[PDB]
Structure 1
Amino acid sequence: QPVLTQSPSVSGTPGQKVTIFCSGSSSNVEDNSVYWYQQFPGTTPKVLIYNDDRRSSGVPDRFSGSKSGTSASLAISGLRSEDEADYYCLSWDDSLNGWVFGGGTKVTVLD
């Protein structure tokens, strides 16, 4: 099972400010760079955030990443319909000595 903890499903309506969370521990999120990627069903992932809080080229400005201790978050400032996708976080883990991942949060955009 995924080492990082992400809620499997989060919903919002257009324009809502929704932040999704990536809960880790001292050996991973707290000590290492976190990355986030977006994956539409059946599609190649797009890295949104690298090095905790840096936004990749080719990403809408409504996305931002941050960290708070053992937790990382991806904030969507104004949900849009095209944001319906699966969002994954990952980092190195010092204890496992390898990559660790969340299970992904599927964002649903409702009317």
Structure 2
Amino acid sequence: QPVLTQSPSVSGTPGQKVTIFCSGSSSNVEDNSVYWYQQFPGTTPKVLIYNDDRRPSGVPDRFSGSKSGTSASLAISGLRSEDEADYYCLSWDDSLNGWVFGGGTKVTVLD
């Protein structure tokens, strides 16, 4: 099982602001840099957020990240159809001494 907890699936319509969550513990999320990535089926992930809240140049400005204690979050401010994908969080874990991951949150853009 993934050591970090993400809700498996979220829906929304274009334009809606949706935030997804990544819950960990004192020995991971709380403690350590959190990274988020976006994965479409069959292709290489795109890093959306590194070091908790930093957005690479080239990632659309509607994506932002932050960390509140044992919980990290990724906000998508104005969902687009092209945002339908699987979103993962990860960080180092002090107690397992290696990388830990959420199980991914699949975002569906409806209408």
Pairwise TM-score range, normalised by the shorter structure: over 0.9
Q: TM-score, normalised by structure 2?
A: 0.99
Report Cα offsets for 1:24-52 as digits up to 9, x if no partner.
00000000000000001111100010000
Give the alignment of 1:53-92 within 5 angstroms: 53-92=53-92
Instruction: Give the SS at the match of 1:37.
Output: strand
Q: TM-score, normalised by structure 1?
A: 0.99
Offset of residue 106 of structure 1: 0.3
Report Cα offsets for 1:46-82 as digits up to 9, x if no partner.
0010000000122000000000000000000000000
How many angstroms apart in 2 are the aligned matches of 1:88 and 1:33?
14
Q: How many residues align?
A: 111
Q: Give every structure 1 segment of 4 or more consecutive aligned residues whose post-TM-superposition deviation is greater than 6 Å.
A: none
Offset of residue 95 of structure 1: 0.5
In structure 2, stretches of 5+ residues that fail to align are: none
Offset of residue 88 of structure 1: 0.2
Identity fraction in percent: 99
Q: How large is the Cα RMSD of the aligned pairs?
A: 0.4
